[PDB]
Amino acid sequence: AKRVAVIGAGVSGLAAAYKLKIHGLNVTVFEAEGKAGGKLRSVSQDGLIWDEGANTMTESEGDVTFLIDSLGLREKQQFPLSQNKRYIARNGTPVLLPSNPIDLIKSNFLSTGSKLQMLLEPILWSHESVSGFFQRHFGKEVVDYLIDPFVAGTCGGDPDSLSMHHSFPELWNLEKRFGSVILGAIRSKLSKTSANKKRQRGSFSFLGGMQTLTDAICKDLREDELRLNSRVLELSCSCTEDSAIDSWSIISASPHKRQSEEESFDAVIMTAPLCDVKSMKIAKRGNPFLLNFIPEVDYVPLSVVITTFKRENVKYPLEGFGVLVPSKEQQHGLKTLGTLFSSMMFPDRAPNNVYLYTTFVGGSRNRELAKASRTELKEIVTSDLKQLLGAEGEPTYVNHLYWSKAFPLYGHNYDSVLDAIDKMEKNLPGLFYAGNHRGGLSVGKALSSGCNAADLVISYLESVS
Amino acid sequence: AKRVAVIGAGVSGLAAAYKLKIHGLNVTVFEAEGKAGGKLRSVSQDGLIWDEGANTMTESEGDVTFLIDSLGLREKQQFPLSQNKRYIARNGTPVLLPSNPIDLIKSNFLSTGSKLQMLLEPILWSHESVSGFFQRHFGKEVVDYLIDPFVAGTCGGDPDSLSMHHSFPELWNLEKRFGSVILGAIRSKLSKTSANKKRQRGSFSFLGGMQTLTDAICKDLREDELRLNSRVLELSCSCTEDSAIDSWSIISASPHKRQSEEESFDAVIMTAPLCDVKSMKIAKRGNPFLLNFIPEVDYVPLSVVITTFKRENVKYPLEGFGVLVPSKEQQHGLKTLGTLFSSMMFPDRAPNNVYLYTTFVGGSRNRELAKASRTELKEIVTSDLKQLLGAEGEPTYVNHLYWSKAFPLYGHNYDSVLDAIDKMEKNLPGLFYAGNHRGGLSVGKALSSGCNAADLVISYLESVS
Numbered sequence: 001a002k003r004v005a006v007i008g009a010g011v012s013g014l015a016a017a018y019k020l021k022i023h024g025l026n027v028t029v030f031e032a033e034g035k036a037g038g039k040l041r042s043v044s045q046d047g048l049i050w051d052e053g054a055n056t057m058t059e060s061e062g063d064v065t066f067l068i069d070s071l072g073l074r075e076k077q078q079f080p081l082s083q084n085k086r087y088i089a090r091n092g093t094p095v096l097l098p099s100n101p102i103d104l105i106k107s108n109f110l111s112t113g114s115k116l117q118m119l120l121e122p123i124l125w126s127h128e129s130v131s132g133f134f135q136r137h138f139g140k141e142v143v144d145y146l147i148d149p150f151v152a153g154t155c156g157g158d159p160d161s162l163s164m165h166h167s168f169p170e171l172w173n174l175e176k177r178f179g180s181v182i183l184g185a186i187r188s189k190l191s192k193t194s195a196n197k198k199r200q201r202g203s204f205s206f207l208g209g210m211q212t213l214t215d216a217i218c219k220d221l222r223e224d225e226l227r228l229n230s231r232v233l234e235l236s237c238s239c240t241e242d243s244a245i246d247s248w249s250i251i252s253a254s255p256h257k258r259q260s261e262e263e264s265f266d267a268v269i270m271t272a273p274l275c276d277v278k279s280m281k282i283a284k285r286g287n288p289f290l291l292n293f294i295p296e297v298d299y300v301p302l303s304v305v306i307t308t309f310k311r312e313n314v315k316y317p318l319e320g321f322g323v324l325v326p327s328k329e330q331q332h333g334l335k336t337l338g339t340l341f342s343s344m345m346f347p348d349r350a351p352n353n354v355y356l357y358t359t360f361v362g363g364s365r366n367r368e369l370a371k372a373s374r375t376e377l378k379e380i381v382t383s384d385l386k387q388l389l390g391a392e393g394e395p396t397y398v399n400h401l402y403w404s405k406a407f408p409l410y411g412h413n414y415d416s417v418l419d420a421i422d423k424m425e426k427n428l429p430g431l432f433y434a435g436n437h438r439g440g441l442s443v444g445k446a447l448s449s450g451c452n453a454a455d456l457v458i459s460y461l462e463s464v465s
Numbered sequence: 466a467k468r469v470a471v472i473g474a475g476v477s478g479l480a481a482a483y484k485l486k487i488h489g490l491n492v493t494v495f496e497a498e499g500k501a502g503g504k505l506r507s508v509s510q511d512g513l514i515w516d517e518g519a520n521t522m523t524e525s526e527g528d529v530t531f532l533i534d535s536l537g538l539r540e541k542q543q544f545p546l547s548q549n550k551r552y553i554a555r556n557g558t559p560v561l562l563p564s565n566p567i568d569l570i571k572s573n574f575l576s577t578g579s580k581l582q583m584l585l586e587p588i589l590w591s592h593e594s595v596s597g598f599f600q601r602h603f604g605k606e607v608v609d610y611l612i613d614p615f616v617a618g619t620c621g622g623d624p625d626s627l628s629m630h631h632s633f634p635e636l637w638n639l640e641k642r643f644g645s646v647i648l649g650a651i652r653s654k655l656s657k658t659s660a661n662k663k664r665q666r667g668s669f670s671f672l673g674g675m676q677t678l679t680d681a682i683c684k685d686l687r688e689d690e691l692r693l694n695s696r697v698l699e700l701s702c703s704c705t706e707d708s709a710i711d712s713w714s715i716i717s718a719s720p721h722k723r724q725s726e727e728e729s730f731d732a733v734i735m736t737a738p739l740c741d742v743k744s745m746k747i748a749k750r751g752n753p754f755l756l757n758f759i760p761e762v763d764y765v766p767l768s769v770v771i772t773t774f775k776r777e778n779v780k781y782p783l784e785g786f787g788v789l790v791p792s793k794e795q796q797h798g799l800k801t802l803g804t805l806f807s808s809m810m811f812p813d814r815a816p817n818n819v820y821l822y823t824t825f826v827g828g829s830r831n832r833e834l835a836k837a838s839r840t841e842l843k844e845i846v847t848s849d850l851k852q853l854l855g856a857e858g859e860p861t862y863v864n865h866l867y868w869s870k871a872f873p874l875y876g877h878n879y880d881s882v883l884d885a886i887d888k889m890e891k892n893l894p895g896l897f898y899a900g901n902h903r904g905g906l907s908v909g910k911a912l913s914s915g916c917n918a919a920d921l922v923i924s925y926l927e928s929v930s
């Protein structure tokens with residue numbers, strides 16, 4: 001009977017733990033926090049249902065489809081009732097975003113010089129930032145009101161400080177080969193097998209919030225499987241002796257109330273953020289194993305603010321999923337990142353005579369705004385909501401959660417970060433990392449790095465013989 | 466006792482007569498010529514196997530796939546063994562053509578200038594010839610070395626005398642709506658077998674020639690079904706009296722029977738070319754129908770010449786399906802329209818130590834060439850094959866067939882031609898036309914117009930309370 005340690009009870013760790021159990025292996029999951037949900041955190045209150053973390057997800061990954069079926073969550077899968085229409089703030093007011101490439105050249109959303117620069121992109125065309133790349137290829141307007149809002153809506157980050165290579169792999173490649181983005185994209189998408197049937201390829205959630213997914217995985221784990229409040233402090237792997245595959249031991253705190261303890265395992269799946277792996281006393285044989293080589297990864301800080309206005313006071317409502325605020329719009333009074341039209345997407349999340357708005361504040365464009373008092377946050381949100389949707393008066397209700405490290409910032413030296421994760425995995429056998437600082441930042445992707453970590457542990461525990 | 470006469474045993478007629486038969490309806494097919502084959506005409510002699518008519522076909526039509534299955538011709542369906550690569554004669558020599566429109570900008574088939582006009586087409590952009598349209602939109606080079614070779618390869622016609630509207634419907638529409646071809650195409654190009662598509666697309670044939678299809682339909686039509694040499698001379702429909710659905714009597718001639726003959730039917734599917742319908746004494750009640758004003762449609766004349774050179778004498782062979790000769794290449798010594806690489810596509814069609822070349826001569830660019838003597842034709846073909854493929858000496862073998870009316874020329878007044886076909890149909894009840902002067906000139910299309918004509922008859926057969 002082999003045992004596998006899994007540090008972190010986020011969607012990634014739960015994915016890994018689940019894929020592990022259904023294959024016999026006995027598992028133990030250490031969770032620093034008091035609740036299992038990872039960045040997936042749904043809350044239920046006074047006639048409201050909201051997500052303080054991930055709000056939606058997609059199944060572009062085989063593993064997502066697989067899990068949705070295993071746990072039997074199809075009936076709980078919830079799609080938006082509202083049309084898929086996103087808006088961008090331009091000069092300080094919502095403008096409808098173009099649904100497809102054609103409308104881009106056919107509408108007025110772009111200047112005459114931007115369209116010509118796009119159309120002629122096929123002819124006119126290491127550490128490059130998302131911003132630089134797109135700039136030289138399609139122009140500034142397209143970086144400011146298109147790719148910027150997109151990055152803001154994905155991690156709340158800033159185009160100027162993201163590795164183009166690491167952020168958009170599917171595009172860095174095409175340039176290397178084809179040389180001109182426009183041409184490449186066309187080449188491919190215009191000329192792992194699981195179930196599904198291209199049925200509702202859009203995004204979606206689950207009745208009750210994104211946390212429903214995480215809970216489903218937890219109902220298959222015993223109280224001894226899932227150890228909450230037990231944050232991992234140290235790791236230790238002993239080799240040699242009389243046996244084979246090395247042995248790992250975990251020192252987690254709160255063994256009770258301000259207590260410490262240990263346990264021995266055969267493999268360990270690392271799922272906590274890279275900035276948390278650093279503050280972990282890990283040792284090889286008998287002498288420490290210094291993580292000095294771990295580059296210092298930065299994070300996008302931001303808080304999710306929830307507000308609710310009586311429909312009678314929202315002068316200019318918009319139909320769709322929400323509004324993104326281009327960092328350039330700060331010079332127009334808009335201080336938030338963007339806001340989702342929650343009750344419009346999921347009307348059950350609130351009373352039919354009110355609007356539920358999930359707003360994101362802070363981000364790379366303004367870190368000291370994520371840490372504002374609920375009051376200060378309350379006004380920031382109202383202020384933008386007034387100017388964007390014509391929201392009149394006070395929020396009727398306000399709540400929020402602050403994430404000091406919401407998303408990993410795939411920066412310049414991110415080419416080296418990956419190297420360290422690999423150096424660590426190579427020098428400390430049995431240890432497999434599967435955070436979201438590798439595969440990508442999205443429920444779906446982390447889920448996959450979790451599964452992929454589990455069967456990596458599996459063919460390692462079985463390579464023995 | 467439901468009598469259904471189909472005039473003409475071409476693919477269209479045979480398709481119609483087949484669709485009919487498998488739905489009860491007794492049928493009779495009059496075929497002016499000695500052999501059933503329509504424009505489909507295979508010849509299997511001298512270790513050679515060639516087609517004097519249609520050489521290849523496609524199943525972009527549902528009816529084509531249906532027929533291939535009913536008659537069970539899948540095993541006889543034959544695809545080219547050579548790579549789908551076509552060449553264009555330029556300045557005097559073959560030039561590989563871009564397989565799919567996208568290498569059309571990476572490749573050097575077009576000038577930088579011709580790409581600018583193309584890429585910017587989205588911004589810069591009753592009758593009007595195929596030539597005029599394409600000219601104003603993409604430039605002269607694209608008309609001369611792209612859309613012209615295309616038309617030459619489809620009907621041997623000339624861009625300057627073809628209705629843009631009637632020739633390319635799928636494109637005349639997009640301009641009306643979207644306004645700029647390029648943009649439109651993009652919004653419509655990216656809007657049961659295992660190798661279905663690759664086969665659904667990509668032209669093919671059948672072991673033994675295109676005629677094999679025609680023959681499969683003929684082995685399912687008893688002796689009383691197909692009447693050869695029995696050319697239709699007059700039509701006559703009687704109404705009133707004691708019954709219902711009008712009558713239809715055919716007066717077809719004979720040579721081994723002398724005089725003539727008659728027969729009565731309930732419906733009549735016209736399949737002969739519109740230029741033949743004119744030379745048909747047809748009458749309504751008791752008084753004629755005359756025709757001192759029929760849309761006298763013109764035709765593209767041309768002959769299919771067959772030659773065969775010993776491989777040892779073909780200096781510069783090319784891999785692919787063939788070569789197309791832009792009409793502008795006449796000022797360079799090339800007098801032909803194009804030639805297929807017959808034994809390369811189908812190596813079973815000839816001895817492995819020789820090359821079988823199917824060349825088309827004449828066409829709109831030179832009518833008095835399609836009527837040349839086999840000798841004069843033997844030289845013309847040789848002359849071009851030398852300059853194009855480095856063919857040395859005489860053909861080793863020569864044969865040919867001359868079609869004085871190979872293809873219907875969809876000219877200017879073709880908007881009115883269709884009106885007459887409908888006037889005739891809405892007029893004389895029971896009579897349905899289904900030639901190739903309507904649906905389009907290609908085996909696949911005519912086959913469809915035949916099927917669709919059959920169940921149209923079936924509706925008329927019914928629709929009787």
Ligand SMILES: Cc1cc2nc3c(=O)[nH]c(=O)nc-3n(C[C@H](O)[C@H](O)[C@H](O)COP(=O)(O)OP(=O)(O)OC[C@H]3O[C@@H](n4cnc5c(N)ncnc54)[C@H](O)[C@@H]3O)c2cc1C
Nearest residue numbers: 008010011012032038039053054055056232272442443446
């Ligand atoms: C505000 C916000 C909104 C988002 N919205 C979306 C969205 O709409 N769509 C989408 O696809 N993605 C969204 N995401 C991203 C998505 O939520 C994450 O990619 C995903 O949850 C990451 O999962 P994970 O399991 O890798 O990590 P996490 O969820 O971060 O979990 C890691 C776990 O490690 C535990 N841990 C840390 N240190 C220790 C230790 N020493 N010992 C034990 N346990 C430890 C933590 O407590 C935590 O539970 C959003 C993220 C945020 C922050």
Ligand SMILES: Cc1cc2nc3c(=O)[nH]c(=O)nc-3n(C[C@H](O)[C@H](O)[C@H](O)COP(=O)(O)OP(=O)(O)OC[C@H]3O[C@@H](n4cnc5c(N)ncnc54)[C@H](O)[C@@H]3O)c2cc1C
Nearest residue numbers: 473475477497503504518519520521696697737901907908
């Ligand atoms: C040289 C050449 C090459 C071609 N190559 C290709 C190719 O590679 N790919 C492709 O897709 N298409 C090709 N085509 C086009 C395609 O073959 C034709 O569009 C199609 O065969 C037309 O079919 P149809 O039934 O309308 O007419 P036809 O085949 O002409 O048949 C009409 C029938 O009417 C009969 N008829 C006429 N008058 C009378 C009368 N008075 N009484 C009784 N019967 C009568 C005729 O004898 C004939 O059999 C080619 C055409 C030609 C001429």
Ligand SMILES: Cn1nc(-c2cc(C(=O)O)c(Cl)cc2F)c(Br)c1C(F)(F)F
Nearest residue numbers: 153155156321322323337338339340360
């Ligand atoms: C995670 N998230 N989602 C949105 C967001 C996304 C969309 C979308 O298009 O999916 C919309 Cl409409 C509005 C948002 F606020 C934003 Br600004 C953020 C972030 F990163 F700031 F926290």
Ligand SMILES: Cn1nc(-c2cc(C(=O)O)c(Cl)cc2F)c(Br)c1C(F)(F)F
Nearest residue numbers: 551617618620621787788802803804825
């Ligand atoms: C019917 N036909 N096919 C070709 C032809 C077509 C292709 C092709 O594109 O498939 C090629 Cl490579 C060579 C030809 F000669 C030509 Br020029 C003709 C015509 F109209 F002149 F009789």
Ligand SMILES: CC(C)(C)CC(C)(C)c1ccc(OCCOCCO)cc1
Nearest residue numbers: 086097146147149150151153154170324
């Ligand atoms: C390959 C992709 C589809 C991931 C990214 C590309 C560059 C095409 C892109 C990038 C940005 C973009 O802007 C729309 C803003 O909407 C935010 C939605 O979250 C639209 C497309």
Ligand SMILES: CC(C)(C)CC(C)(C)c1ccc(OCCOCCO)cc1
Nearest residue numbers: 551562611612614615618619633635789
């Ligand atoms: C929709 C079509 C296929 C009718 C026409 C378009 C404009 C796409 C076209 C037109 C011309 C063209 O040139 C290639 C010559 O190929 C000879 C094949 O008979 C390629 C494509």
